[PDB]
Amino acid sequence: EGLNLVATALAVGLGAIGPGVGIGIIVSGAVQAIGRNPEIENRVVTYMFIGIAFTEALAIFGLVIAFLIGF
Amino acid sequence: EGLNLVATALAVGLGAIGPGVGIGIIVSGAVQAIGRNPEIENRVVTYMFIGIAFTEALAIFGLVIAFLIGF
Amino acid sequence: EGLNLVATALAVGLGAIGPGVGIGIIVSGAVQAIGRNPEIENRVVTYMFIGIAFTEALAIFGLVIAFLIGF
Amino acid sequence: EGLNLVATALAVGLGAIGPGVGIGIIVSGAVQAIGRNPEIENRVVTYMFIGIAFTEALAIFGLVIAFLIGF
Amino acid sequence: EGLNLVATALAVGLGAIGPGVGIGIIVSGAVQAIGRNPEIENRVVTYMFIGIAFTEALAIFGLVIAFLIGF
Amino acid sequence: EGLNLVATALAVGLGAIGPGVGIGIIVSGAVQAIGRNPEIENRVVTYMFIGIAFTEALAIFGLVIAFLIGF
Amino acid sequence: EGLNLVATALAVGLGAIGPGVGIGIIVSGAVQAIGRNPEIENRVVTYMFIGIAFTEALAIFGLVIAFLIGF
Amino acid sequence: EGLNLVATALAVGLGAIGPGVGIGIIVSGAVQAIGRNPEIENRVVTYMFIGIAFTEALAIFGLVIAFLIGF
């Protein structure tokens, strides 16, 4: 039946909320730090884009398995 | 069977809860840092929009997956 | 069966918590910033509002899917 | 079948979870801003009411589908 | 077929979750502002009620659906 | 059928999770206000207790609905 | 049929998550206020303890519902 | 069927979710209090330990209920 479709739904929806709030927390902390001190932007930027990527990786898994259900 | 329809609803739902709190945190930190230091109001905007584009991609993927399984 | 009927209910109900908390934190942070500094009253109005739409858009997403299932 | 009652309950509950904390965050932010400085009362109240209006619009969006399920 | 019972139960529980944390953050912000400045007592608490009289009101709607199960 | 049992459990748990974090936030805010300024704790205590009662109303509503479903 | 086991599981799990974050925030605020000043530590410790008591009341209500369902 | 196994798993997981964020908030607040004038170390560690004692008490409640269902 549609259990594969349910699996795709669970994979795309659940597993995206985690990174969905993680991106926001990361960028908000970075923005607050950069506002309190703009003379350390570069380093901040680095610590931005790694962290995003890491939690983006958490999203990526929750994406790819869904495609693996699609086959 | 309507299992595809409930799967689509669940997919779009848990895909939508993902960004919302995230982007809220994004622009809340952005406006707070802007108020903290009005001098910096250009780089912060760019990084806030970059983070928004980072997080809303998950929601867009959930929406397009829901549409794909809805047709 | 009523599974299609409950699908619309999940579609509208889900993806409302995310944008709801997003709206909450957006307005809270913007009001905090404007309280700390009224001189930014223009900018804090602009950015927060577009953020509103972002969150709002997500909710609307789920809502439209409900109708996409309701009929 | 009785699943329509379950659908109404799901609609109202999942549409109530979001704005129920959203309006709380709105009021908390507005009251904190007022306590920080009691001179921006009118603008803060107006923006708080805008946020309340958006969140209650989400609540009504849930409510109308909850009623339509009974239809 | 006791779907009505789980329907009303889920309705009341999920209409009570949101307003609970909303009232919690409302009262926290209100008492924090009161501690910051006493003489604003009559004003901010009113907005608190303006928030609170909304929160539980929405909860009543969920409870109404519960009573609508008896209808 | 055993649907009454899951109904009661859903009622009590879903109507109890919200008030838990709500009362936690209420008392934490009152704690912070008292710690930073203990002279006005009486009004702070009164407002904290009325907020506790407000959310405990929802908690008791959920518990009573669970008990009614049980019998 | 085993649905009673699922009911007990739901009751205990919901009664567990509900106040855990609540008591965490309780003691976090209490220790923050203590760190701010140790002079009035006892008076505020009383309030944080009664807040913890209310949270435990909610949790153990959820627990005894599961116990009642089990028998 | 294996619905008993699902009940056990849901019980342990949803009994563990609450304490996970609980003790996190506890230790975050405790270390934050420590970082501000670390002179009240004994009191803050004692209060953090009793808080995590309550939190792990809820965790153990969930664990033992899951284990008893495993019987």
Add this chain to the structure above:
Amino acid sequence: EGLNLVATALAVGLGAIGPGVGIGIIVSGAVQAIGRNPEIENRVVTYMFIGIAFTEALAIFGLVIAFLIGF
């Protein structure tokens, strides 16, 4: 029909969601505290360790119960 697979899934997911949100707060609070001042330094470090250890126990259950289901 394969309920043990979804049982293991529920166990792992619902027992890892707790630590996932917990540990981040646990060590992030200490990181910002030690950024505020590095004098106390490793004296605080062990705390997050044992704090992590605490939620690690939950994570252990989040595997162990699943490892019981899987084999």
Add this chain to the structure above:
Amino acid sequence: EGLNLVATALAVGLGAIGPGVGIGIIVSGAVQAIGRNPEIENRVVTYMFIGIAFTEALAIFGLVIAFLIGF
């Protein structure tokens, strides 16, 4: 039957819900610590990487459980 696919999807989704927000909090706190002052950057980056590894432990636990269920 099909329960294996939804099991794997739920496992990855709820193994990504936790580490996502955990990584978000980790990077936010770490970058705030960077914004506080330099000359402590290396130590707090090491602590941030420790937290990232701790969350990635749960992430890979969920991923490997999903892969095992797929086999």
Add this chain to the structure above:
Amino acid sequence: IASRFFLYTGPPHVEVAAEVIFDGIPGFPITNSFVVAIIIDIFVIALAVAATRNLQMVPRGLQNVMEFILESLYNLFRNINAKYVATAFPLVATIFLFVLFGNWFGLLPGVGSIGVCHTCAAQGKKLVPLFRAPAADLNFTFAIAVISFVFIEYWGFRALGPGYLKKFFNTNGIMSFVGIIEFISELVKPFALAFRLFGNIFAGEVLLVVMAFLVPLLLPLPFYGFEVFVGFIQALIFALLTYAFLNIAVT
């Protein structure tokens, strides 16, 4: 008191659908959306020619209103970016004015009630609503979203060298792992715009229709106010997002 007492007008009316093509008897058939779009274009042209027919110092009346609206938009766009505030002004300004009147047109009496058919609902006719909000259709909204995306890409390529495709598909290390989806997000920026604008007007008009079915009078007035508000917010925000995306692209 103020009781409703509108059971006669409380008949079952929960009809909702996507864009409805009009008669289109000749070639290239038209829809109900593309007569409302035409009438909004006519209204905008009439307002512009009314503001343009008498231009002088010390603006007053309609001319002053047009100047204030245009100058507010100019200030808002300058606050984001001042270099392209004149190079991209006509597009964003046209986007705001066209959408806002289209959104407000759906609130006029007759929207969803005037049935083109072949109102006419007692019979077996389709009773297709003549007045359908142009922004509540996935054709006009998709067209404006795609033309905005084309404008962003062209001007994002007009002055960037071959460096526009440097933030994506780069070999800078970790920037690669974020460079692809950043482009992918850039791919979904128009779509996310369109589904944003199309749904919001559709959601509001369906809310108003449902509230009419629930209680015909005195119930939907706050929702009418909220919708006349949110329509202008959406119309402004679409142009604001277009300008912000252009600014982040040129930078």
Add this chain to the structure above:
Amino acid sequence: SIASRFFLYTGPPHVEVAAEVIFDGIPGFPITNSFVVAIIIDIFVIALAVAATRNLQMVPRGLQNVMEFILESLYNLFRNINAKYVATAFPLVATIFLFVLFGNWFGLLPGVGSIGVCHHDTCAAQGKKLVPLFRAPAADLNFTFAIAVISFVFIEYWGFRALGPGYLKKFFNTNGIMSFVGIIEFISELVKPFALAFRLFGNIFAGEVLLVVMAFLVPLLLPLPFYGFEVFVGFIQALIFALLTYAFLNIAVT
């Protein structure tokens, strides 16, 4: 010695009874497995009190000092909570803490979950089933219900006496604020003693279940952190029960 369960397998958690069990057969009211432990704890409390206060030495030393220190700490804490009502409630709140603490610690004593009378353990070989002996009174709902209702009656009486007729009906006549909160306050006070009893009931019960289960998994070096957690949480539960009772009294009067 991690895999010592192979040599000594504890067996399934036979201790899962959610009610008191009569230990000695009596024609009238039987002595439950929790009642005998309550009597034993009372006897131990009497013995330690009569040992500490037999001589009443001026300078406290040894057991007298140990008994005096905890009582003085409780007195100071209650004085910190409320000023004038310490003496009116000190014996009840003091005995509600000491009595349940030893029973809580009695659960951690060896043989609490294994030693028992007949009606794979030992009695399974015989026809009569094996029931446990030494069950903590706090693990029984009857004892917790009794102490909770005693505390509820106490706070009701000392609120009625303190506020006269006002505590009889709070301020229901306000109709502006104390109109819906008053009934909310009343139902909160109604559910308070049930929560009090159930808190002590569940904590000790879950303690016994965890101790038995940990033996089933690995009965060597695994239940040691849990044993420490439980001996800590029993004392903490007794303390929070006493503090909660006194704080409820304090909010009742004021």
Add this chain to the structure above:
Amino acid sequence: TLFIAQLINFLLLIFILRALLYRPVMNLLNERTR
């Protein structure tokens, strides 16, 4: 038949908006003209 209800609602909303927003909009327009 919904046309009458829609017209009544639109007229009521227009009257409410005109009554509650004429003075501030007119003052803003006069200030902009000045």
Add this chain to the structure above:
Amino acid sequence: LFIAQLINFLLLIFILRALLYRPVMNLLNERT
């Protein structure tokens, strides 16, 4: 219908561009 909508939007954009070029010039002259 998407192509027709895009063409109509482009025509309206050109008309509004002419109208604004008149109004932007008027505003610039007023500023000077």
Add this chain to the structure above:
Amino acid sequence: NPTLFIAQLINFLLLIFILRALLYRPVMNLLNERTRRIE
């Protein structure tokens, strides 16, 4: 019965409280003597 068991437990708790009142009274007297010596 369960009601009889609850009543018996309540009676035992009341007796324990009455007995501890004698113990608390000696402790109160000792504390008062210590305070008087401090005075």
Add this chain to the structure above:
Amino acid sequence: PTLFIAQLINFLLLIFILRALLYRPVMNLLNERTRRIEESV
């Protein structure tokens, strides 16, 4: 029963572990009480 032996072993180990850390605190409390008594004079 073997449960009794396991419980006895666990109780002995827990008692030893707890005493190894509580010997210092109980002795410290007794010393504080003795110091207060001496200060009473």
